[PDB]
Coordinates of C-alpha atoms and ligand atoms in Angstrom, one line a residue:
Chain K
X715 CA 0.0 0.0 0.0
X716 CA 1.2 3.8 -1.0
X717 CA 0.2 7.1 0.2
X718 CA -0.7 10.6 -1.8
X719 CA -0.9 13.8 -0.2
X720 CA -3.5 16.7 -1.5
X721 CA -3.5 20.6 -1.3
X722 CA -7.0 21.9 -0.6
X723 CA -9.0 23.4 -3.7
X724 CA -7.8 26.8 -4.9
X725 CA -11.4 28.0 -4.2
X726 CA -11.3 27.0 -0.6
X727 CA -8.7 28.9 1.0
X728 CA -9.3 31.8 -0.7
X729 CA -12.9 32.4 0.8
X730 CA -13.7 32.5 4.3
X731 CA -17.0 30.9 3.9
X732 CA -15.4 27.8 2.3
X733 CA -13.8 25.1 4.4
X734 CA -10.3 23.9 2.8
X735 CA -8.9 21.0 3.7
X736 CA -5.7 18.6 2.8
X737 CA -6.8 15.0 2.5
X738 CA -4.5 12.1 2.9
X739 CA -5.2 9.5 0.8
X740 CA -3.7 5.6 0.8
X741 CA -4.8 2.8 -1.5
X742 CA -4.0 -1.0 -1.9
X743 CA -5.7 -1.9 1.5
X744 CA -5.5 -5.7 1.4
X745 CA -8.7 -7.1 3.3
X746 CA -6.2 -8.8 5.3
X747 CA -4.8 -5.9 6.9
X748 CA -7.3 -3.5 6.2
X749 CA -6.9 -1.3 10.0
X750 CA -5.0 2.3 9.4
X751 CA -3.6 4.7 11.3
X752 CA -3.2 8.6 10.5
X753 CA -1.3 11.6 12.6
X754 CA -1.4 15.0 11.3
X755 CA 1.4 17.7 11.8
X756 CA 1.5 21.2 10.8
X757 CA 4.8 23.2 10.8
X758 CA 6.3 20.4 12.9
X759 CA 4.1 20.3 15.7
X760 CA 1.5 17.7 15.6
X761 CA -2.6 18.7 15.7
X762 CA -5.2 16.8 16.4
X763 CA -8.1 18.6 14.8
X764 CA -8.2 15.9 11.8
X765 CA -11.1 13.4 11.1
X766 CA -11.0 10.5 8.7
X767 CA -13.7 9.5 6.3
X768 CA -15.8 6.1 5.9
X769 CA -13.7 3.9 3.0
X770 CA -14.7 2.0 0.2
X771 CA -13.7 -0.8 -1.7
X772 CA -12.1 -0.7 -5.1
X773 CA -12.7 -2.8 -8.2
X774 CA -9.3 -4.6 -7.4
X775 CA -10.2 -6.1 -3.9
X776 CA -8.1 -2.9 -1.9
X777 CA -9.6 -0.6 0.6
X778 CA -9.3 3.0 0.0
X779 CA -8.7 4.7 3.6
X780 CA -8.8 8.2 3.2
X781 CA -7.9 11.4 6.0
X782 CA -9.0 15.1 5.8
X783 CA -7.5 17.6 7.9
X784 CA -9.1 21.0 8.3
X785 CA -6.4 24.1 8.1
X786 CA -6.7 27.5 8.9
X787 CA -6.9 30.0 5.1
X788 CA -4.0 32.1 6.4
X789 CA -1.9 29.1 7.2
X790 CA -1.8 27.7 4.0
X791 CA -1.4 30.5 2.7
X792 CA 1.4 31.5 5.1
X793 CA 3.8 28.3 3.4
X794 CA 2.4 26.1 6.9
X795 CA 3.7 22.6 5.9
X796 CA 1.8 19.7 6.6
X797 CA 2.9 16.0 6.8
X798 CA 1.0 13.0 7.5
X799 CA 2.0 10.1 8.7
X800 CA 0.6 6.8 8.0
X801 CA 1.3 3.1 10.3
X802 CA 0.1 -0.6 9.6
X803 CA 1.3 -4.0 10.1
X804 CA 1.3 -4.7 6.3
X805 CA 4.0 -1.7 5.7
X806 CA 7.5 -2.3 7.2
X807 CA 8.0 1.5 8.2
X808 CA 5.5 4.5 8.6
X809 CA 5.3 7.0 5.3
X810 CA 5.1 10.2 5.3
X811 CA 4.0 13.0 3.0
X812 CA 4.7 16.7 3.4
X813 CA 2.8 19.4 1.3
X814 CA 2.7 23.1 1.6
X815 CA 1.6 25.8 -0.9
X816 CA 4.5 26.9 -3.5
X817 CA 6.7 29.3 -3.1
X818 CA 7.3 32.5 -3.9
X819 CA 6.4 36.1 -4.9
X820 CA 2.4 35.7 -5.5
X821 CA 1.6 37.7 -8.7
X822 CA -1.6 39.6 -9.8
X823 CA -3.7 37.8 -12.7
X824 CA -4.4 40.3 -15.6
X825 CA -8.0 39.0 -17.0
X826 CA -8.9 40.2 -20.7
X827 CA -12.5 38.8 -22.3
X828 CA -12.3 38.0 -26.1
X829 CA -15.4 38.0 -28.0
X830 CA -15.7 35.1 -30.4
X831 CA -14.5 35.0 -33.6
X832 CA -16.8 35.7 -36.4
X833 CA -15.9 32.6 -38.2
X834 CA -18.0 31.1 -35.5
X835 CA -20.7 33.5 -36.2
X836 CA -22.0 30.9 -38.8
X837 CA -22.6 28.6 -35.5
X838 CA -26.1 28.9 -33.0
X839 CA -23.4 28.5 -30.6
X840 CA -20.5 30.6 -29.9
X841 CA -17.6 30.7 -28.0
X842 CA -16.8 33.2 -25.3
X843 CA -12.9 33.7 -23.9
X844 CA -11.4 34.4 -20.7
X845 CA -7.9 34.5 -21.2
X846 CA -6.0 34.8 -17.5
X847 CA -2.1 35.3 -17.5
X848 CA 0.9 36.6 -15.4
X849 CA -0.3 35.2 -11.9
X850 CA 1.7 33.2 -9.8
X851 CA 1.3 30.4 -7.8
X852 CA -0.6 28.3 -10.4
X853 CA -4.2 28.3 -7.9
X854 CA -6.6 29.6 -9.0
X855 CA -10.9 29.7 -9.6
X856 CA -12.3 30.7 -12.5
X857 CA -16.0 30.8 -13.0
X858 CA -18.6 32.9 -15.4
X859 CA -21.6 35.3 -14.4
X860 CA -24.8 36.8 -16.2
X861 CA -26.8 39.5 -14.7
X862 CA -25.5 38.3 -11.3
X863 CA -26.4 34.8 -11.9
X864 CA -24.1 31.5 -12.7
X865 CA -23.4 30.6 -16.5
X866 CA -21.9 27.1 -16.2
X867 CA -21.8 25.9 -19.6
X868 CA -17.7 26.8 -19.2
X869 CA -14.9 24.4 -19.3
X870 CA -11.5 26.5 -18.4
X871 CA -7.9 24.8 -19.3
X872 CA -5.5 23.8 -16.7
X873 CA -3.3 26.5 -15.8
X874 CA -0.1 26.6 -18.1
X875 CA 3.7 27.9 -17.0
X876 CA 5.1 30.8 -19.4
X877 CA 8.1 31.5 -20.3
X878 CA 8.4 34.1 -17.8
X879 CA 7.6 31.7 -15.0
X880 CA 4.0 32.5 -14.2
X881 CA 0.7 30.9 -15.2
X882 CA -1.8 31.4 -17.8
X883 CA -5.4 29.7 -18.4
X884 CA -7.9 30.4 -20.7
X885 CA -11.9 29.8 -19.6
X886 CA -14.4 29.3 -22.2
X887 CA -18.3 29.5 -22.2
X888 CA -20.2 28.4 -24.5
X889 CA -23.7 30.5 -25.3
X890 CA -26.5 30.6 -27.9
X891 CA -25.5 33.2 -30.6
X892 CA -29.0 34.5 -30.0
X893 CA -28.1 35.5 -26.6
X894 CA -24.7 37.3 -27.8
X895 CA -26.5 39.0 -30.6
X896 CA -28.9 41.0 -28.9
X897 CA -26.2 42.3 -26.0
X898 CA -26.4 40.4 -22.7
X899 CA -24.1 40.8 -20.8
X900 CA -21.3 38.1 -19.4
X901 CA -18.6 38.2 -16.9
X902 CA -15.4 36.2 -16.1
X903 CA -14.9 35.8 -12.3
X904 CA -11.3 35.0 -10.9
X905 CA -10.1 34.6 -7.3
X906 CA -6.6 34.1 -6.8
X907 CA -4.6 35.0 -3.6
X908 CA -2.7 38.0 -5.1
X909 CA -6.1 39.9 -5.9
X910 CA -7.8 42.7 -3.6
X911 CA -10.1 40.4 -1.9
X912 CA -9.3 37.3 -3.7
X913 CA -11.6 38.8 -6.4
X914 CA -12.2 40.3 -9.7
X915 CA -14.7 40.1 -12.6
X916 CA -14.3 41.4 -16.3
X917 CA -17.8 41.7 -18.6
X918 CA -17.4 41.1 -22.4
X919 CA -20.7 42.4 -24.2
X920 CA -21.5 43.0 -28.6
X921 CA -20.1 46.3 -28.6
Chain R
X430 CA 11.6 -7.8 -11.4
X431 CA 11.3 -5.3 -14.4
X432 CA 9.1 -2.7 -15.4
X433 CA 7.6 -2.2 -19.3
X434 CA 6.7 1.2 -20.4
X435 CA 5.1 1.7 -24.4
X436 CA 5.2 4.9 -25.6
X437 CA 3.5 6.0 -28.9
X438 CA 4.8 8.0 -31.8
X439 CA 4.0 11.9 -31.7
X440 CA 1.3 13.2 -33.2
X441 CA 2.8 15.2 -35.9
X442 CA 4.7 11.3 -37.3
X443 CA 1.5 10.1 -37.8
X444 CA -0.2 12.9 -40.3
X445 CA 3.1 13.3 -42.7
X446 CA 4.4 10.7 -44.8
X447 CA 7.5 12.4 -44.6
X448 CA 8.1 11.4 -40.7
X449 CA 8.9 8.2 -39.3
X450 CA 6.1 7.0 -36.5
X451 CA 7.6 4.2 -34.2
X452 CA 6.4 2.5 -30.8
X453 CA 8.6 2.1 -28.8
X454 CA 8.9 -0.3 -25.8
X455 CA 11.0 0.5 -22.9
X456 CA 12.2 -2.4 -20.2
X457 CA 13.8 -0.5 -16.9
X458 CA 14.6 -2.5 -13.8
X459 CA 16.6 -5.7 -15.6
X460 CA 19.0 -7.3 -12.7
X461 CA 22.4 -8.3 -13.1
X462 CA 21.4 -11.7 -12.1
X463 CA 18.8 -12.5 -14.8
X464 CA 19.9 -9.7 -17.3
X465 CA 18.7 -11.7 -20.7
X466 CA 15.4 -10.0 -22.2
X467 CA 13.6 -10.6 -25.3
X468 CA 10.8 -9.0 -27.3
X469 CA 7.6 -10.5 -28.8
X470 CA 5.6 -7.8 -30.8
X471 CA 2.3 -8.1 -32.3
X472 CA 0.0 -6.1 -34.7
X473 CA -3.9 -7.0 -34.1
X474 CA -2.6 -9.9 -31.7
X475 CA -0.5 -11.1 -35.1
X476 CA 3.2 -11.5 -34.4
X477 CA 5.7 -9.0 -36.5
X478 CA 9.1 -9.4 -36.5
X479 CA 10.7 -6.0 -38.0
X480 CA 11.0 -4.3 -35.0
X481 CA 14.7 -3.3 -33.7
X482 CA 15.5 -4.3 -30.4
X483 CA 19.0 -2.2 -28.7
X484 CA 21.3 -4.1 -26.7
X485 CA 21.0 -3.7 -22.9
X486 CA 22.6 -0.3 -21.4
X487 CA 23.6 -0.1 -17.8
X488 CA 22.7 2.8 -15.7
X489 CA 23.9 4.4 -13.0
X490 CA 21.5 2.5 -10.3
X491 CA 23.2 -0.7 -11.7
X492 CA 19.9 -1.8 -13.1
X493 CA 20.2 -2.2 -17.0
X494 CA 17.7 -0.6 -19.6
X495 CA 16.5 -2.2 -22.6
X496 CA 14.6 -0.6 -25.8
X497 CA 13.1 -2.7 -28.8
X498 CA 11.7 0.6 -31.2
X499 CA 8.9 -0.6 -34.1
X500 CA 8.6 1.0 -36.9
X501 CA 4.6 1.5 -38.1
X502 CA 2.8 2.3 -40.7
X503 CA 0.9 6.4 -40.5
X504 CA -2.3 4.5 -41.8
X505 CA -2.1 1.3 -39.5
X506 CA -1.9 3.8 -36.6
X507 CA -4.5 6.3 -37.7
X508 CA -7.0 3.0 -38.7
X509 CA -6.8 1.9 -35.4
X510 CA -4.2 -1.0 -34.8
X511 CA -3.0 -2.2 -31.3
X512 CA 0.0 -2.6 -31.0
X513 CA 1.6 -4.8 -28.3
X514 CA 4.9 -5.3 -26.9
X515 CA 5.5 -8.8 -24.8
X516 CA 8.6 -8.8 -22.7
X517 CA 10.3 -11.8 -21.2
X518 CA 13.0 -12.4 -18.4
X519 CA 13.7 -15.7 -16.5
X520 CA 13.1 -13.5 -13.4
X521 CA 9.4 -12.6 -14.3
X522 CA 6.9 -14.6 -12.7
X523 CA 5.0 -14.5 -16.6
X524 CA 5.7 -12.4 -19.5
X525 CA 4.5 -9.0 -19.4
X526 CA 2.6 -7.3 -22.2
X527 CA 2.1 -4.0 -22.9
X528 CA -0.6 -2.4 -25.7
X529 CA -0.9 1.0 -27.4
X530 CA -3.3 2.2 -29.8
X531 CA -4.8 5.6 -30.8
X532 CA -7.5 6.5 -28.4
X533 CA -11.1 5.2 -29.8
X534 CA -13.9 6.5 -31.4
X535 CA -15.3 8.8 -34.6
X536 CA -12.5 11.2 -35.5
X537 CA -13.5 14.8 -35.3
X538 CA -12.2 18.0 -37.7
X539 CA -11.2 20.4 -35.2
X540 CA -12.2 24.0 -36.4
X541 CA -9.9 26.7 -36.1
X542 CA -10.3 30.6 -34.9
X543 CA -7.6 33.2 -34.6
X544 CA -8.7 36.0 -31.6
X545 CA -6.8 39.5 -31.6
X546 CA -5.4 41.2 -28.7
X547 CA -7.9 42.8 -25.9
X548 CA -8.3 46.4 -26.0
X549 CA -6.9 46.3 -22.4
X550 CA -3.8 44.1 -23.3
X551 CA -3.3 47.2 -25.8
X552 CA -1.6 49.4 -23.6
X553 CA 1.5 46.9 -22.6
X554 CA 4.9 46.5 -24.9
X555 CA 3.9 42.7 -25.6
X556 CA 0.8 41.4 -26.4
X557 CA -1.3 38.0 -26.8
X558 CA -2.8 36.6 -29.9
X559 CA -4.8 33.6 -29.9
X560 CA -5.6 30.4 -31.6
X561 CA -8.5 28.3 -30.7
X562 CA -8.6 24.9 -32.1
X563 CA -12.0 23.4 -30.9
X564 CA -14.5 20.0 -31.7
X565 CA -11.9 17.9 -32.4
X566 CA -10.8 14.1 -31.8
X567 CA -9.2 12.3 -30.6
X568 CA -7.0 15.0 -28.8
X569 CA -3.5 13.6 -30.6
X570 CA -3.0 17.3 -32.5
X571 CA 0.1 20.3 -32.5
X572 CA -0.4 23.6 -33.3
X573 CA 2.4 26.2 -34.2
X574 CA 3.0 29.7 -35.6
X575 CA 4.7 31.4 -38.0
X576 CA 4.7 34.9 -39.5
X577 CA 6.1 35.7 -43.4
X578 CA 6.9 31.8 -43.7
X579 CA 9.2 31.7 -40.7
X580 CA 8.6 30.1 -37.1
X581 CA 7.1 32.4 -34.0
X582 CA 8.3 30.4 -31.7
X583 CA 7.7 33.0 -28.4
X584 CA 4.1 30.8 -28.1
X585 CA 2.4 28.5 -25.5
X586 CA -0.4 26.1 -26.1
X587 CA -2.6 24.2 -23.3
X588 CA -3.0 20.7 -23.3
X589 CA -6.5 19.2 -24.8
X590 CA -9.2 20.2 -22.6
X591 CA -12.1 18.0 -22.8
X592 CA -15.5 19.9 -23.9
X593 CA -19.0 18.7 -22.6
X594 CA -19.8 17.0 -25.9
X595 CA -17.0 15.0 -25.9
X596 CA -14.4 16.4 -28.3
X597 CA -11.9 18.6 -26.9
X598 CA -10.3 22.1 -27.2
X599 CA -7.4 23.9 -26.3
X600 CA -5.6 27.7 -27.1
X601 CA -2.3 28.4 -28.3
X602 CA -1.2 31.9 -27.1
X603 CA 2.1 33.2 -29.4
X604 CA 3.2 36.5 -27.8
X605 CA 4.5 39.0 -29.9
X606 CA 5.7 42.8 -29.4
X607 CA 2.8 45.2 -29.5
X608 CA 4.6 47.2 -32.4
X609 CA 5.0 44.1 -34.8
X610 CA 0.9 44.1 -34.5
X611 CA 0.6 47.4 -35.5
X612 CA 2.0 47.9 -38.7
X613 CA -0.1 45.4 -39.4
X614 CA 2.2 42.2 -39.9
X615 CA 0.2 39.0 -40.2
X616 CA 0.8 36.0 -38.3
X617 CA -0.5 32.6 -38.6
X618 CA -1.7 29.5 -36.6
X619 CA -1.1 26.4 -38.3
X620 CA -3.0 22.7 -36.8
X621 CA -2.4 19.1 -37.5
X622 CA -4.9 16.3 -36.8
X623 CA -6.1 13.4 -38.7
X624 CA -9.2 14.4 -38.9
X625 CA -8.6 17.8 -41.1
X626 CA -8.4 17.5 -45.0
X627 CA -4.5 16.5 -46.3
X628 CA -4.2 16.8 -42.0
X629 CA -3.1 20.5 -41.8
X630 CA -5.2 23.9 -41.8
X631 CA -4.1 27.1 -41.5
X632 CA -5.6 30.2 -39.9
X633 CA -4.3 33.9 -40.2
X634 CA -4.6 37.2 -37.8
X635 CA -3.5 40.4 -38.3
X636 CA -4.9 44.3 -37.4
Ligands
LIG902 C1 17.2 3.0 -12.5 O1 17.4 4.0 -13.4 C2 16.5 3.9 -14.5 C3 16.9 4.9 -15.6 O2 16.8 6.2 -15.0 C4 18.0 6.9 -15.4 O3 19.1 6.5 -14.6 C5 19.0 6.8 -13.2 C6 20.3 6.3 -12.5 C7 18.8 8.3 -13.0 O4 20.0 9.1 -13.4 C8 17.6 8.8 -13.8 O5 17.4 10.2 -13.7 C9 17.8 8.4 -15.3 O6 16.7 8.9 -16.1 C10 15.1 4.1 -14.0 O7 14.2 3.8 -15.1 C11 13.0 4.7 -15.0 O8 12.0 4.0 -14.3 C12 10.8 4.9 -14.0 C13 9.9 4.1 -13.1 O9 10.0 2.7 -13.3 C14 10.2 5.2 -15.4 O10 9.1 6.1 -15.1 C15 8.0 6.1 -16.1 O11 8.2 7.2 -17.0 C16 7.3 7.2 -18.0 C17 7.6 8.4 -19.0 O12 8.9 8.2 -19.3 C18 9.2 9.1 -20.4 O13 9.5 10.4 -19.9 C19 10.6 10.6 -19.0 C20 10.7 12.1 -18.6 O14 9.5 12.4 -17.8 C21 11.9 10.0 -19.6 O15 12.9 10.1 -18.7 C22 11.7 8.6 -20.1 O16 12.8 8.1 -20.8 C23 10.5 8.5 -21.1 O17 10.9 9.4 -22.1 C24 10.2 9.1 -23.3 O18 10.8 8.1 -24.0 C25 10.1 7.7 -25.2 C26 10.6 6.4 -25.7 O19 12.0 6.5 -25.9 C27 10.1 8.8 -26.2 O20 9.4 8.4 -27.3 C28 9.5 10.1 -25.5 O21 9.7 11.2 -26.4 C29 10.1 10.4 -24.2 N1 9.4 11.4 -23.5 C30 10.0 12.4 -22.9 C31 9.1 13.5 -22.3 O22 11.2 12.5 -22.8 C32 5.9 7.5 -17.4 O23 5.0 7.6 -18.5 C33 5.6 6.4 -16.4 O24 4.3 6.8 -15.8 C34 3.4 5.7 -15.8 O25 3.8 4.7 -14.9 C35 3.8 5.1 -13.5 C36 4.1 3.8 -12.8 O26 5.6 3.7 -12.8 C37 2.5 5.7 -13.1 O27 2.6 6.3 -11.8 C38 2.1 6.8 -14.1 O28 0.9 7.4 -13.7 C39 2.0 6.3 -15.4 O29 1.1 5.2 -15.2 C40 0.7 4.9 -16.5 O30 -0.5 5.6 -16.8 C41 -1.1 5.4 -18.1 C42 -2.2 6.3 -18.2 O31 -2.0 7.5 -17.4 C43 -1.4 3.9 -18.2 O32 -2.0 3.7 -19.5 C44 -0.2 3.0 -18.0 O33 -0.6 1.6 -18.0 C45 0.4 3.4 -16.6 N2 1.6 2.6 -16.4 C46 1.9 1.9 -15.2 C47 0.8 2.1 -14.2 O34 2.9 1.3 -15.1 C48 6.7 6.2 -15.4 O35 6.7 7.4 -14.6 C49 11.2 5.9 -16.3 O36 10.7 6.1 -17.6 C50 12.5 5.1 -16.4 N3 13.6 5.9 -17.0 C51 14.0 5.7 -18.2 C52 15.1 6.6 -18.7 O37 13.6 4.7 -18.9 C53 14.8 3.0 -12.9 O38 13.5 3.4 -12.3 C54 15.9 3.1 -11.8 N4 15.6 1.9 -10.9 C55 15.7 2.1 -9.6 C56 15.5 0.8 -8.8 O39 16.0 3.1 -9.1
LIG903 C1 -6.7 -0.6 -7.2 O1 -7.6 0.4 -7.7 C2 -7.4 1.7 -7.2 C3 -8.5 2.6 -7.8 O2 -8.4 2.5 -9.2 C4 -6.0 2.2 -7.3 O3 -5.9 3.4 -6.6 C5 -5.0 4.3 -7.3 O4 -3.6 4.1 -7.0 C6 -2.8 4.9 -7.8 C7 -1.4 4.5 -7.4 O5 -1.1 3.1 -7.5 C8 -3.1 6.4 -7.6 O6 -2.3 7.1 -8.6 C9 -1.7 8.3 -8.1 O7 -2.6 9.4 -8.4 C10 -2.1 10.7 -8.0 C11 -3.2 11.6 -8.2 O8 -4.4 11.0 -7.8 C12 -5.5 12.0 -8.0 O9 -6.0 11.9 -9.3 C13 -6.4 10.6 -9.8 C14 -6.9 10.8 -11.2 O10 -5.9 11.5 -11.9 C15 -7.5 10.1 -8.8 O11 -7.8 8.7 -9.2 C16 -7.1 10.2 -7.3 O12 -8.2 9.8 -6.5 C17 -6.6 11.6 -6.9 O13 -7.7 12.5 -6.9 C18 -7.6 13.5 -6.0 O14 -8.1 13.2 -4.7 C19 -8.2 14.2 -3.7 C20 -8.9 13.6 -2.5 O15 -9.6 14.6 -1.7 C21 -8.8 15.5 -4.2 O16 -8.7 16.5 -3.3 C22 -8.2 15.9 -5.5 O17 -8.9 17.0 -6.0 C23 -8.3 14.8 -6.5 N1 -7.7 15.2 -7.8 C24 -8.1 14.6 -9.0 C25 -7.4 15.1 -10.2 O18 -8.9 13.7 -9.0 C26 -0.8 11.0 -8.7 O19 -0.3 12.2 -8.3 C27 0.3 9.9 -8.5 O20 1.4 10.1 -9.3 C28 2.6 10.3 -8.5 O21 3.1 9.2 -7.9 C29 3.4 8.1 -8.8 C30 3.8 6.9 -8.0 O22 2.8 5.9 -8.1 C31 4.4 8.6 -9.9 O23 4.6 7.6 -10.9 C32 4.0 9.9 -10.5 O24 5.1 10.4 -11.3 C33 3.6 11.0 -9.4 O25 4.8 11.3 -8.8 C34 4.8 12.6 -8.1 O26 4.8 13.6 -9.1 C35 4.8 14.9 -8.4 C36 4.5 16.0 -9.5 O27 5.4 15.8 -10.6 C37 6.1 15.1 -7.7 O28 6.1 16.4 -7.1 C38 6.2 14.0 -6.7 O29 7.6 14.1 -6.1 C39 6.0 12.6 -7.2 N2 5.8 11.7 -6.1 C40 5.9 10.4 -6.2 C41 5.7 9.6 -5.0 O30 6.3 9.8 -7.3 C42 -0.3 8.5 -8.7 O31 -0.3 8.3 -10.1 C43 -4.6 6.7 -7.7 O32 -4.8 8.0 -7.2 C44 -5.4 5.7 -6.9 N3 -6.8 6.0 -7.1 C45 -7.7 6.3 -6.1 C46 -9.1 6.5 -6.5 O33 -7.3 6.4 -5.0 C47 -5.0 1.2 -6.9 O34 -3.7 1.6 -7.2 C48 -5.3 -0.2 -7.5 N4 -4.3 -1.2 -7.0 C49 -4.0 -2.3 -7.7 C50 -3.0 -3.2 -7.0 O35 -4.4 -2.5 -8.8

């Protein structure tokens, strides 16, 4: 059996209505010696505010024990890192995994909306862009907005390194040309940790 | 004992009968003990036998390395074959075997839009234009620039992103110097996939 370590979700330590967590994961549980044990410790101390979660069974006769630890926003976003440590009979020796947030400089995304193209004008669907560049560390949330309300036929690329060593994404969502023809409205929401309150929003509209 | 890694050609070997596509089939993890390997490979579960095996190189963990490279045919791969590499040691409990292909189902003609610069981007020294290359599959594809003939090289493309209709998309950003936009100089996006007639299209953007 192996363990895998997991940062929380961009979104969730950048709100302080959302709960992020980092979740230790281990797999190839034989039901023979299926009993785990977990211990959680941030910045070298140990905590105790973890829970584990009920487990499965996979397709391949393993267990899947799993481990989420609550963290404080400003700690993980602080460079807090957080190893856990895992101990059963069927592994000779206890892993451990230690995570943090990358480091460095945080950078401000610059967000520009591009229309679509008018080759796509021929389509009853057309394609509306989000490009997202220059921001550094690589999490990020990117989500789109009409008239206050979610538009969530979007898919947004993973974010890619530039030359210059930030990131850059693009977000796309999709809409009926009718909708884009007679002037609504849309708007590209980012949060990244580098913005005024985690937040901003560019509209893109028929001109 | 060893490991077997398959790795298939590149997607641009494929589309041009001018490249060579090969499979090749990678054995790491060879003892000193039991160092003798050999190679079966099949086509369709038929045995071949032009494939060209390397002798066994040592590396620096004292473990050797082992390489058997087949040559394929661009239509075999883009028709579908599986290819499969069978690797034997006296070690090895069994055999193990190894199978590529192209991913499976309908090809799809990905369709093509260049996107200028953002008004906002405007008012920096360098400046983003954009290629999206939408609808298509499977996601094997490359995209480059060029500008009077010659490569732009200063670009960055995502990986495949898969859409909600089950084709994918991705953007290739080439950054360029805001001045070279504005006399008006043209620059292209050029695409490779199976699925596009003579498997190449070419878009254009300029001011
Ligand atoms: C002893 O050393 C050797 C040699 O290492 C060399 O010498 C030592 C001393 C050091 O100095 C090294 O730095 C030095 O490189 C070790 O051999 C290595 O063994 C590891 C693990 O066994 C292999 O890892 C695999 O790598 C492949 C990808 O490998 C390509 O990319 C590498 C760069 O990232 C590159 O180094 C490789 O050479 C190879 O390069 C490609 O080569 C092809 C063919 O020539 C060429 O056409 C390409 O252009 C070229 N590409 C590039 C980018 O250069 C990786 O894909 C593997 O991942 C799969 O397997 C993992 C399980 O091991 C799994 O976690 C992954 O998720 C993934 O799993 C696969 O997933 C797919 C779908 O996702 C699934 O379909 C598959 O079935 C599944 N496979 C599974 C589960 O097995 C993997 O990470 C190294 O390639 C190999 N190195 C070399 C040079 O061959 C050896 O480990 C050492 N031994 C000890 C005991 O220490
Ligand atoms: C039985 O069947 C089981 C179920 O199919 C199977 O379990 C699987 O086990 C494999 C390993 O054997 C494990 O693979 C690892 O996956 C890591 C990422 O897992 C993500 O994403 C995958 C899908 O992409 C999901 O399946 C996972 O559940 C997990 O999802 C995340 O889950 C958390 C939980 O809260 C969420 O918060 C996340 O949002 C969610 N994300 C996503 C995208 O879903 C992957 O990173 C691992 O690769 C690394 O280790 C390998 C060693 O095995 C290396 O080969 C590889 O190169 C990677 O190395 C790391 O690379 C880093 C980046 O470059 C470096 O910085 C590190 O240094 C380097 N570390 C190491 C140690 O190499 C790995 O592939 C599956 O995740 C797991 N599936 C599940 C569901 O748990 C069993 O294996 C089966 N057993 C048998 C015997 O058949």
């Amino acid at each position: 059996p192996s363990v895998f370590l997991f940062p929380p979700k961009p979104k969730d330590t950048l709100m302080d209505s959302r709960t992020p967590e980092v979740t230790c994961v281990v797999v190839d549980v034989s039901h023979e010696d299926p009993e785990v044990k977990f211990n959680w410790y941030v910045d070298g101390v140990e905590v105790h505010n973890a829970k584990t979660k009920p487990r499965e069974e996979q397709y391949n006769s393993t267990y899947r024990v799993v481990s989420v630890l609550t963290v404080l926003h400003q700690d993980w976003l602080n460079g807090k890192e957080y190893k856990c440590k895992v101990s059963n009979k069927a592994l000779p020796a206890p892993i451990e995994k230690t995570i943090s947030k990358a480091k460095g400089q945080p950078r401000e995304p610059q967000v520009y909306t591009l229309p679509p193209s008018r080759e796509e004008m021929t389509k009853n669907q057309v394609s509306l862009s989000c490009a997202v560049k220059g921001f550094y560390a690589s999490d990020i949330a990117v989500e789109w907005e009409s008239n206050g309300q979610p538009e969530n036929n979007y898919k947004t690329t993973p974010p890619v390194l530039d030359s210059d060593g930030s990131f850059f994404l693009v977000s796309k969502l999709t809409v009926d040309k009718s909708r884009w023809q007679q002037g609504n409205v849309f708007s590209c929401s980012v949060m990244h940790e580098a913005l005024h309150n985690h937040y901003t929003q560019k509209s893109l509209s028929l001109s």
